[PDB]
Amino acid sequence: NPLKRLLVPGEEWEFEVTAFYRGRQVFQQTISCPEGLRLVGLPGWPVTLPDPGMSLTDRGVMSYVRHVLSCLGGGLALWRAGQWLWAQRLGHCHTYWAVSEELLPNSGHGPDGEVPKDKEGGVFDLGPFIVDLITFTEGSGRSPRYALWFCVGESWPQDQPWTKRLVMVKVVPTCLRALVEMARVGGASSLENTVDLHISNSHPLSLTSDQYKAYLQDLVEGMDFQ
Hints:
The protein is of the alpha+beta class. It is 23% helix and 31% strand. The chain has a 6-stranded antiparallel beta sheet with strand order 2-1-11-10-7-8. Strand 1 (14-21) and strand 2 (24-32) form a beta hairpin. The longest helix is centred in the first third of the chain and has 13 residues, at 59-71. Residues 11-164 are annotated as: Interaction with HERC5.
């Protein structure tokens, strides 16, 4: 089962990082690293968010962002261990996360949680994501979400960053976006389509809907479920 490769330790996943200031995109990078990444302003590939002065004109908003970049310190660490994606806030910025669509909706609801500092925290589980992907290939479910959204606030917990969302960073494990695209562009015909897993030393593979689905089924056995 070629998909089982996603889980083997050492297989580095590719992550697309996109940051937004005032809901406006100001940076994007696609990193691949064994110790994961670190959003900055210790292990992990450092991803440096840009100074607002290079894209904003509002004095008030720029100041806020300069404060966020100032509390990041060690930064927001995100890495993979097994079937889980883990996050840990090493700096002083209160940072919250949520798993959502490619675009985070304004939706009067709070974040899935706050990223812990003293110990790592589970932010994404491949298991339930893959079962959903299966029920989606059958046409009895909705496409599973895979976009990680991190809202970064100041050190002083009075700004309620999740409300204005002035500093947002979207992290997308490219293998997952590719797996959903394969599912959709798979029920279109009955032949072969090529899917790029976007992991280290992997050759893109062409499978038919049937083969792909069979592998997704066996893939579930390679993960833990409570």
